[PDB]
Amino acid sequence: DPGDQICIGYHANNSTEQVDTIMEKNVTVTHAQDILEKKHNGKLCDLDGVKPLILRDCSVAGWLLGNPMCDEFINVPEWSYIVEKANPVNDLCYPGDFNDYEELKHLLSRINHFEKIQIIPKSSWSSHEASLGVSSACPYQGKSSFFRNVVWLIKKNSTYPTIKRSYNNTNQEDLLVLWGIHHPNDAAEQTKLYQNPTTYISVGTSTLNQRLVPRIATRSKVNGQSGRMEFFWTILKPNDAINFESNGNFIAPEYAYKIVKKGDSTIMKSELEYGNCNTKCQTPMGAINSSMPFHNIHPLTIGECPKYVKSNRLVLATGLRNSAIAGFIEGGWQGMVDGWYGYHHSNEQGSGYAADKESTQKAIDGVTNKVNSIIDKMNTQFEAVGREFNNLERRIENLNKKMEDGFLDVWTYNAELLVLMENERTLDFHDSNVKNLYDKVRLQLRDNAKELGNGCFEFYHKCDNECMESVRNGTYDYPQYSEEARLKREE
Amino acid sequence: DPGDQICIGYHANNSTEQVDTIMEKNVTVTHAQDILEKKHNGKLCDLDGVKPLILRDCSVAGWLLGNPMCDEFINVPEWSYIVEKANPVNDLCYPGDFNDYEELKHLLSRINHFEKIQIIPKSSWSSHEASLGVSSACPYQGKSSFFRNVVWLIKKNSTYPTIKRSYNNTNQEDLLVLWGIHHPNDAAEQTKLYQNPTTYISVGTSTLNQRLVPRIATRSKVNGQSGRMEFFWTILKPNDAINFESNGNFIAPEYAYKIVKKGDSTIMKSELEYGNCNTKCQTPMGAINSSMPFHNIHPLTIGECPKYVKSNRLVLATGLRNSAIAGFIEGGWQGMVDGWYGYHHSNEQGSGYAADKESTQKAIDGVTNKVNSIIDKMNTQFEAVGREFNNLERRIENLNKKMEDGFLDVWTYNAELLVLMENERTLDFHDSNVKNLYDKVRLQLRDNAKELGNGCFEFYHKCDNECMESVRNGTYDYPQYSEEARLKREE
Amino acid sequence: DPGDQICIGYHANNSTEQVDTIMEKNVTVTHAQDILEKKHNGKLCDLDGVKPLILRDCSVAGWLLGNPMCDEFINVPEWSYIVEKANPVNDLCYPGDFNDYEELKHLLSRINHFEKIQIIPKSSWSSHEASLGVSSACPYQGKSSFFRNVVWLIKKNSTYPTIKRSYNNTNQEDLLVLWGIHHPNDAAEQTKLYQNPTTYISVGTSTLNQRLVPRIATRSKVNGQSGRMEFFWTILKPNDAINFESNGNFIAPEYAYKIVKKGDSTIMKSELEYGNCNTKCQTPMGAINSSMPFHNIHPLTIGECPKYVKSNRLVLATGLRNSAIAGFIEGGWQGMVDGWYGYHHSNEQGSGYAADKESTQKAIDGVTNKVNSIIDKMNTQFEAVGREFNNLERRIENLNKKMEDGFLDVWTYNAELLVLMENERTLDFHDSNVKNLYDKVRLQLRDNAKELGNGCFEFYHKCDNECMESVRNGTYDYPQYSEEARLKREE
Ligand SMILES: *[C@@H]1O[C@H](CO)[C@@H](O)[C@H](O)[C@H]1NC(C)=O
Ligand SMILES: *[C@@H]1O[C@H](CO)[C@@H](O)[C@H](O)[C@H]1NC(C)=O
Ligand SMILES: *[C@@H]1O[C@H](CO)[C@@H](O)[C@H](O)[C@H]1NC(C)=O
Ligand SMILES: *[C@@H]1O[C@H](CO)[C@@H](O)[C@H](O)[C@H]1NC(C)=O
Ligand SMILES: *[C@@H]1O[C@H](CO)[C@@H](O)[C@H](O)[C@H]1NC(C)=O
Ligand SMILES: *[C@@H]1O[C@H](CO)[C@@H](O)[C@H](O)[C@H]1NC(C)=O
Ligand SMILES: *[C@@H]1O[C@H](CO)[C@@H](O)[C@H](O)[C@H]1NC(C)=O
Ligand SMILES: *[C@@H]1O[C@H](CO)[C@@H](O)[C@H](O)[C@H]1NC(C)=O
Ligand SMILES: *[C@@H]1O[C@H](CO)[C@@H](O)[C@H](O)[C@H]1NC(C)=O
Ligand SMILES: *[C@@H]1O[C@H](CO)[C@@H](O)[C@H](O)[C@H]1NC(C)=O
Ligand SMILES: *[C@@H]1O[C@H](CO)[C@@H](O)[C@H](O)[C@H]1NC(C)=O
Ligand SMILES: *[C@@H]1O[C@H](CO)[C@@H](O)[C@H](O)[C@H]1NC(C)=O
């Protein structure tokens, strides 16, 4: 009056953390983990400890040629990725085109070493006019000027003698060389400037075999010239030579560029500050330190990154559903300060809670392992997501978009369902575990005690603290009390 | 002789609906849902309430230029996608080429507004022959004729004077302009037609800088001309001007086209009728109203669509395995007219079936939630799947094919396995639920009744209808009958 | 002293095979299956019973034109895929270019029929020099020579008369035709060789309309010529004709090629021997006979193949966790020589183990079905993974790489997690099965026997071998022993 007791129960707490399973929405849970990265540092940072290349209002074109209003960061021998604005103000001062422009950007996205040199001195032009080739389309100190890396040759007295110049790459490294042809308005401008009326430029390497001829049209004024400049480029292998020849209309090299190229990258489209940080994932809205296997920031990322997923929350249940002294069948015990599953005894030496170290370790190690698998099994490659196509490559641009949207639709769907199914699995694990511990006890006692129905057993004998620890240890000796039990039963 | 009874059991029905799980094939089930869309309305319909553009035997080329045998639907100011046949009969009446043809189709796939206008009246040609430029390759009323949107200029008396024409876009909207060059057979035809023996066309905008020169070859007759026409096009920004100049061989604009462009789409390859319907998914074999997250019709779709999957059936088990008065251990009760899990009592006031509202709601809400997750978690973007590459882009066409086949192989595999694993999960849920309800009862009664082994309990006392409702309610008072039970037991 | 007994238990064995589940790492198991193909036969073999095309040191270019040092396998009328080395020694003997080279390789990757013919006899050149067009860049028997499939025409006496040649395809099959233009160094070489100082080649079909003009530059010596040859090609529809015309610099066809084309394939980059085998998956490190739905060899594969996955082991648990005579609660019985789950009785006729045929069949059929689903549900299409882009298509090459790496990242991740989750499912199945068999018995006996707690029941009466077989058969008659039991109990 009354007899000794032991109850099986589980942990609870004041946690309000909610989770979704394939079957139940908004399920309050004990503790849970988010696997979606949502947080960016709002800045552009190094990549594997290498600065970017941030063109403030210039453009790879304007930058290369020397657009005089491109007052930028001149000296910088290497970079990881490149950063243009949306529509950079300063591009081509004198209007025209850049042969294979995009393919060049892509090549310049990631440079190991980059040193500008001088292949044809501006002073070497003894029999042509080097310092007259100047326009009001390219203002400097309020005076007319021109691209500073490349020379507009004019006729001397009234003579454009044929130009023949070879240059030989005697550096250790490939050379990026740049020249151009002036397409003038009419045969007046043509001969006023180059005299000879039928001109041409031939350019030759061991690869190249060029022969450009000025085109005439009536064209609309752009920065007030109806003239057009069209530039070209080659890479000069490290012991080859380039040979120029020109009747006129020649925009000569002054400075070329030594490059060492080690794998690609891409141009990024951002309005952000450098932040002097490092990172391994750069986004056009900030960087990331991704432990997380998913993120939802911006799709146009560079580096080893989490998969981009259209979603706000991916939360994994790690703990339990969250809700005499009645056992598990009437809810969880707040008084289980430590341990996930365990007991509550009450005998003549007194009542306590007592955690199940063994079954609570398997449970934790299991859930820790689940969360870590879902993360460390994620194959993370270096990738650079850019927008590399002009507006006569809209078919190829549209093939790129189906691929990105296609991979988004797959990752966004499989992450959602993986959380929903693997949560339902985690909460049915917690149930299956509590109920297995009841039966661990129930099977040991048998008739030496009675199932009360609330998740406790009342004993048919004296169970002191030392008897309880045999029940929890799973070492309960029944023939040792089978008799004492038998008597208090029959009655 | 005999005692009062209560049995736990489950629903059954005459349903023959079958399902597959990861382990069991052909499993008869109570009721199940198909998640594969297989049904199309065999017609071409609007998209987001916008008509297509159905070219009956013409082609974007033939359509644009005015191939006289292209007796089509002239007036139509906007469209969503475009529809060619396989090999349209009427294309280029006079043989030749269309510069950047594919890139133009892609641009014209989706037009917000499209109004043809007249930039150069056919009557403005005072000093050249506008009405002689006619071929038997382009028959109309059985007479020789030519593309009606573009003019074949010939010499007057025996003089082709130089043409200089500027046109200025003074409309609000971009302009698609079209011209061409006649490549004739020999220097006889050349001068018979344009007189001057060395001709050229220059075309200039703020973008463009063209200079075409007729090519001569000996070429095979095609519609009986060994001549060739080669056409070109530009988009004229809304306050820019285009300037033409020509010694001869010029196919002049008459009519250009105002366009407003708002995102792309694609050309579709169908033999189908317009059906005056709306839709958000169009296929080349009909449209779809996709609640369903998968479909198996045709891969070349346009709109927000289900993922295309190579499969015939994706069926989700929603109900139960389908098979005194014996409880669950001997099968399901047909007599459970309503409810999934429940009881069958039999006492001195009589025998009935009685559904478990509470446990049967959790079950339904759970399964309803599962099916809805598998559907509403599907990220559905607008996409247009076309065939946009010529037969010198077979490498890029082959890159598109690996991507489509690649995404098919992923979706087809993950849908199959998701149904197989999530079915097995649903039927083990139904088992785990029945068996939990047995133990809900079994734990309440204890020795006040006896487990018969068939899934019933026989009572060791009088259980009237009101006692039964405490067992079903889970409010069964045991000390209230513990004594009356104890006596009828001992004996 | 003592009573008759029956125990429920499971199989064990000396197996050390380990497996990972979402929760437990390194779990010793009874037997398990690997689903990753890792084994290749180190050789290049047929595909669907068709030989490849293995160019030992030549290149599609060098091969086609007849580079004299391309001592290869001449006669071969059909092939499946093509095999170059990394940087083939013999390519273009005389330096220059091949118009649309890559697009041609792609076309020649898979040829149904391929017969070389002669369209323009070398002897037909009555008024030009056919046998003087020879260089020291193209040595043969230590003498100067030239591409053997194509003719270098020189002037006769001191006259290059105009060439006009039509050829008409009167074969059943399309024709691949090849010609070229000599770009010489200076106007001296030009007229020394072709006499006329301003030359041209026109080429015309019903498709083509060509007019090439030699270019001059000062170019670097390559195999000691600063000259350059530039070749071109067309496909001649089977009843069309090609017409050549040339003032000079013409490299004439001698031999063209009949082709029948049936779907594409790709060029492969291998250093391997032909092995006279067949296969349906060829890799650049050997072939595969893929039952397996995954492999980890090399990504650049050709045929119907397993998905390429970055992983070393994908192992599926098929058997059980691996560890009176105590029942299941104390471990597995080595003495269960046959059967997965079953019994161990002990009575007055003696003790034995006895397998549960019925429950052990469901288990095997279930696991066999799981492994087969995970394999036979894998959609396997024919695909050819190559490297088809030059180094001015690096943007398109980079779009191909994101797609491959993208599909790798998906398959590698989903296979890892599918094994981890579906293993945990398989071992919880084995538990749920043992424990259901205990309760199958426990429910049949009731008070006619006592739960010992170790997973056995001790009988409260005589159970001979025939009584045991009713318990295993599930046909145990309790009213038949309810009395005999009742007496031996009360006491
Ligand atoms: C879930 O919880 C939030 C409250 O934070 C609520 O906005 C939402 O409507 C709830 N219900 C469902 C069905 O998601
Ligand atoms: C140009 O050069 C000088 C002027 O300093 C003069 O002697 C020479 O004659 C000039 N040439 C011509 C052809 O006018
Ligand atoms: C460039 O100079 C080096 C060193 O004298 C020489 O060997 C090389 O051949 C020159 N370049 C060319 C293309 O001749
Ligand atoms: C488990 O509990 C008993 C009693 O408290 C204790 O003596 C011992 O540490 C454990 N039993 C065994 C066999 O180790
Ligand atoms: C499943 O059921 C259908 C009968 O509708 C039958 O054709 C098929 O062969 C059955 N068996 C299996 C193993 O799929
Ligand atoms: C062409 O124009 C008129 C014919 O009406 C004639 O007066 C004129 O002389 C002609 N020109 C020539 C050069 O024949
Ligand atoms: C077209 O006309 C407008 C209005 O007069 C004018 O401002 C514009 O400059 C003209 N176009 C060009 C390219 O000049
Ligand atoms: C459940 O059943 C009892 C008896 O039928 C009824 O009085 C009551 O509605 C329920 N019990 C409680 C505590 O509400
Ligand atoms: C698993 O087993 C292998 C021994 O074959 C061992 O190398 C590895 O470190 C073990 N442990 C884990 C956690 O993987
Ligand atoms: C070239 O051909 C023969 C030489 O056999 C000679 O009769 C003829 O005059 C030569 N022609 C010229 C223009 O030298
Ligand atoms: C080639 O010869 C056939 C047979 O005589 C002829 O019909 C065909 O028209 C010729 N080719 C061309 C392009 O005329
Ligand atoms: C199962 O076992 C019994 C007793 O061994 C045997 O007679 C019979 O084959 C089975 N029972 C039935 C009803 O078939």
Tab-separated table of N, CA and C in Angstrom, chain B residues 389-459:
chain	number	residue	atom	x	y	z
B	389	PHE	N	19.004	24.535	-84.255
B	389	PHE	CA	20.375	24.451	-84.821
B	389	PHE	C	20.333	23.884	-86.240
B	390	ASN	N	21.100	24.516	-87.144
B	390	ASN	CA	21.296	24.119	-88.567
B	390	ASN	C	22.224	22.897	-88.607
B	391	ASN	N	22.627	22.454	-89.805
B	391	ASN	CA	23.451	21.224	-89.964
B	391	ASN	C	24.908	21.618	-90.240
B	392	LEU	N	25.346	22.743	-89.677
B	392	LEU	CA	26.766	23.028	-89.346
B	392	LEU	C	26.860	23.465	-87.878
B	393	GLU	N	25.845	23.131	-87.078
B	393	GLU	CA	25.818	23.344	-85.608
B	393	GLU	C	25.497	22.005	-84.929
B	394	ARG	N	25.814	20.890	-85.593
B	394	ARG	CA	25.502	19.508	-85.144
B	394	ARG	C	26.234	19.210	-83.829
B	395	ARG	N	27.358	19.864	-83.563
B	395	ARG	CA	28.071	19.710	-82.271
B	395	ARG	C	27.264	20.379	-81.159
B	396	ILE	N	26.751	21.578	-81.400
B	396	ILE	CA	25.913	22.312	-80.410
B	396	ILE	C	24.556	21.607	-80.283
B	397	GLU	N	23.997	21.095	-81.378
B	397	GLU	CA	22.718	20.338	-81.348
B	397	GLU	C	22.918	19.106	-80.463
B	398	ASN	N	24.091	18.479	-80.548
B	398	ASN	CA	24.421	17.224	-79.816
B	398	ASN	C	24.661	17.548	-78.329
B	399	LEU	N	25.175	18.736	-78.010
B	399	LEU	CA	25.272	19.210	-76.606
B	399	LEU	C	23.871	19.420	-76.031
B	400	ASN	N	22.913	19.894	-76.824
B	400	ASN	CA	21.511	20.088	-76.362
B	400	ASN	C	20.880	18.730	-76.062
B	401	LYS	N	21.210	17.710	-76.849
B	401	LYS	CA	20.563	16.376	-76.776
B	401	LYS	C	21.042	15.668	-75.493
B	402	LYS	N	22.347	15.691	-75.193
B	402	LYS	CA	22.923	15.098	-73.953
B	402	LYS	C	22.245	15.706	-72.723
B	403	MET	N	21.931	17.000	-72.763
B	403	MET	CA	21.302	17.730	-71.633
B	403	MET	C	19.860	17.234	-71.448
B	404	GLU	N	19.070	17.157	-72.521
B	404	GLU	CA	17.651	16.698	-72.492
B	404	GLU	C	17.565	15.239	-72.038
B	405	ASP	N	18.302	14.349	-72.714
B	405	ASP	CA	18.372	12.893	-72.407
B	405	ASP	C	18.865	12.717	-70.970
B	406	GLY	N	19.837	13.543	-70.560
B	406	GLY	CA	20.444	13.561	-69.213
B	406	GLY	C	19.421	13.891	-68.149
B	407	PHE	N	18.645	14.949	-68.353
B	407	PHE	CA	17.550	15.343	-67.436
B	407	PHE	C	16.401	14.340	-67.529
B	408	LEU	N	16.110	13.760	-68.692
B	408	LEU	CA	15.088	12.677	-68.754
B	408	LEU	C	15.508	11.520	-67.838
B	409	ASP	N	16.749	11.039	-67.985
B	409	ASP	CA	17.270	9.828	-67.297
B	409	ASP	C	17.151	10.031	-65.783
B	410	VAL	N	17.389	11.261	-65.305
B	410	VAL	CA	17.302	11.648	-63.861
B	410	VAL	C	15.841	11.622	-63.408
B	411	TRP	N	14.953	12.375	-64.060
B	411	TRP	CA	13.530	12.448	-63.639
B	411	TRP	C	12.880	11.072	-63.759
B	412	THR	N	13.090	10.339	-64.853
B	412	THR	CA	12.421	9.028	-65.064
B	412	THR	C	12.834	8.078	-63.934
B	413	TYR	N	14.092	8.106	-63.516
B	413	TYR	CA	14.629	7.174	-62.492
B	413	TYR	C	14.116	7.537	-61.100
B	414	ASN	N	14.119	8.827	-60.758
B	414	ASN	CA	13.819	9.314	-59.385
B	414	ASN	C	12.313	9.224	-59.127
B	415	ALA	N	11.471	9.410	-60.142
B	415	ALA	CA	10.005	9.240	-60.008
B	415	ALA	C	9.689	7.759	-59.756
B	416	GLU	N	10.225	6.840	-60.571
B	416	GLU	CA	10.014	5.371	-60.404
B	416	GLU	C	10.331	4.969	-58.964
B	417	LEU	N	11.541	5.265	-58.489
B	417	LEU	CA	12.012	4.858	-57.140
B	417	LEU	C	11.215	5.583	-56.046
B	418	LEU	N	10.853	6.854	-56.242
B	418	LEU	CA	10.063	7.615	-55.236
B	418	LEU	C	8.710	6.930	-55.012
B	419	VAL	N	8.034	6.498	-56.078
B	419	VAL	CA	6.755	5.732	-55.982
B	419	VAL	C	7.012	4.396	-55.256
B	420	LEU	N	8.053	3.648	-55.644
B	420	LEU	CA	8.362	2.299	-55.085
B	420	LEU	C	8.668	2.397	-53.588
B	421	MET	N	9.537	3.318	-53.182
B	421	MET	CA	9.908	3.471	-51.758
B	421	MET	C	8.736	4.090	-50.989
B	422	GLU	N	8.063	5.104	-51.527
B	422	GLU	CA	7.014	5.810	-50.743
B	422	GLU	C	5.738	4.965	-50.666
B	423	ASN	N	5.548	3.966	-51.536
B	423	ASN	CA	4.425	2.990	-51.415
B	423	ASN	C	4.703	2.043	-50.241
B	424	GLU	N	5.835	1.351	-50.293
B	424	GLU	CA	6.304	0.469	-49.202
B	424	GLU	C	6.158	1.235	-47.877
B	425	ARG	N	6.547	2.510	-47.807
B	425	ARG	CA	6.389	3.339	-46.576
B	425	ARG	C	4.904	3.455	-46.181
B	426	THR	N	4.002	3.649	-47.146
B	426	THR	CA	2.548	3.859	-46.904
B	426	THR	C	1.890	2.577	-46.362
B	427	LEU	N	2.293	1.385	-46.823
B	427	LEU	CA	1.639	0.110	-46.403
B	427	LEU	C	2.179	-0.342	-45.038
B	428	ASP	N	3.417	0.021	-44.700
B	428	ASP	CA	4.037	-0.284	-43.384
B	428	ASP	C	3.471	0.700	-42.346
B	429	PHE	N	3.043	1.886	-42.785
B	429	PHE	CA	2.306	2.877	-41.959
B	429	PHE	C	0.960	2.278	-41.536
B	430	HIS	N	0.199	1.750	-42.499
B	430	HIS	CA	-1.145	1.154	-42.271
B	430	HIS	C	-1.036	-0.003	-41.264
B	431	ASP	N	-0.015	-0.865	-41.391
B	431	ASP	CA	0.267	-1.982	-40.443
B	431	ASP	C	0.577	-1.405	-39.064
B	432	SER	N	1.629	-0.593	-38.969
B	432	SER	CA	2.091	0.061	-37.719
B	432	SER	C	0.913	0.738	-36.997
B	433	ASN	N	-0.121	1.166	-37.733
B	433	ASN	CA	-1.301	1.909	-37.200
B	433	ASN	C	-2.325	0.954	-36.565
B	434	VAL	N	-2.734	-0.088	-37.293
B	434	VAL	CA	-3.635	-1.175	-36.804
B	434	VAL	C	-3.056	-1.732	-35.498
B	435	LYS	N	-1.804	-2.187	-35.548
B	435	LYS	CA	-1.103	-2.877	-34.436
B	435	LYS	C	-0.960	-1.927	-33.230
B	436	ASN	N	-0.792	-0.610	-33.427
B	436	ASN	CA	-0.756	0.393	-32.317
B	436	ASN	C	-2.125	0.520	-31.644
B	437	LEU	N	-3.209	0.222	-32.361
B	437	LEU	CA	-4.593	0.376	-31.849
B	437	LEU	C	-4.953	-0.835	-30.989
B	438	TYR	N	-4.545	-2.027	-31.422
B	438	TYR	CA	-4.579	-3.271	-30.613
B	438	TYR	C	-3.959	-2.988	-29.243
B	439	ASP	N	-2.720	-2.502	-29.230
B	439	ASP	CA	-1.949	-2.270	-27.981
B	439	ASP	C	-2.571	-1.119	-27.182
B	440	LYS	N	-3.239	-0.169	-27.837
B	440	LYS	CA	-3.969	0.923	-27.138
B	440	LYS	C	-5.018	0.278	-26.227
B	441	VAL	N	-5.770	-0.677	-26.778
B	441	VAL	CA	-6.808	-1.490	-26.078
B	441	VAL	C	-6.114	-2.435	-25.092
B	442	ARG	N	-5.345	-3.399	-25.601
B	442	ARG	CA	-4.619	-4.424	-24.800
B	442	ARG	C	-4.066	-3.813	-23.509
B	443	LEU	N	-3.466	-2.620	-23.559
B	443	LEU	CA	-2.835	-1.963	-22.376
B	443	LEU	C	-3.896	-1.470	-21.382
B	444	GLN	N	-5.068	-1.048	-21.867
B	444	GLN	CA	-6.179	-0.489	-21.043
B	444	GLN	C	-6.855	-1.587	-20.209
B	445	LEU	N	-7.146	-2.733	-20.835
B	445	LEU	CA	-7.897	-3.875	-20.245
B	445	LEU	C	-7.013	-4.609	-19.239
B	446	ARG	N	-5.862	-5.114	-19.684
B	446	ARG	CA	-4.972	-5.957	-18.849
B	446	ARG	C	-5.771	-7.221	-18.524
B	447	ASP	N	-5.857	-7.622	-17.246
B	447	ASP	CA	-6.442	-8.925	-16.814
B	447	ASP	C	-7.981	-8.869	-16.780
B	448	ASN	N	-8.599	-7.692	-16.930
B	448	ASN	CA	-10.080	-7.551	-16.999
B	448	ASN	C	-10.620	-8.234	-18.269
B	449	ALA	N	-9.743	-8.787	-19.128
B	449	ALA	CA	-10.093	-9.531	-20.369
B	449	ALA	C	-8.904	-10.382	-20.842
B	450	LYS	N	-9.115	-11.259	-21.832
B	450	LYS	CA	-8.094	-12.236	-22.303
B	450	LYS	C	-7.868	-12.076	-23.813
B	451	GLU	N	-6.598	-11.984	-24.236
B	451	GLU	CA	-6.168	-11.995	-25.661
B	451	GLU	C	-6.516	-13.361	-26.255
B	452	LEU	N	-7.386	-13.408	-27.273
B	452	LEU	CA	-7.856	-14.672	-27.913
B	452	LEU	C	-6.852	-15.140	-28.973
B	453	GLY	N	-5.995	-14.241	-29.474
B	453	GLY	CA	-4.914	-14.561	-30.432
B	453	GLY	C	-5.289	-14.244	-31.872
B	454	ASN	N	-6.584	-14.098	-32.157
B	454	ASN	CA	-7.121	-13.808	-33.514
B	454	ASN	C	-7.280	-12.292	-33.691
B	455	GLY	N	-6.949	-11.507	-32.661
B	455	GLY	CA	-7.056	-10.036	-32.680
B	455	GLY	C	-8.279	-9.525	-31.928
B	456	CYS	N	-8.934	-10.379	-31.133
B	456	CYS	CA	-10.049	-9.988	-30.223
B	456	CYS	C	-9.598	-10.107	-28.762
B	457	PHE	N	-10.373	-9.502	-27.868
B	457	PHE	CA	-10.328	-9.739	-26.406
B	457	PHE	C	-11.709	-10.224	-25.956
B	458	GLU	N	-11.770	-11.318	-25.183
B	458	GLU	CA	-12.995	-11.757	-24.457
B	458	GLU	C	-12.929	-11.188	-23.037
B	459	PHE	N	-14.018	-10.565	-22.586
B	459	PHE	CA	-14.100	-9.847	-21.291
B	459	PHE	C	-14.309	-10.845	-20.149
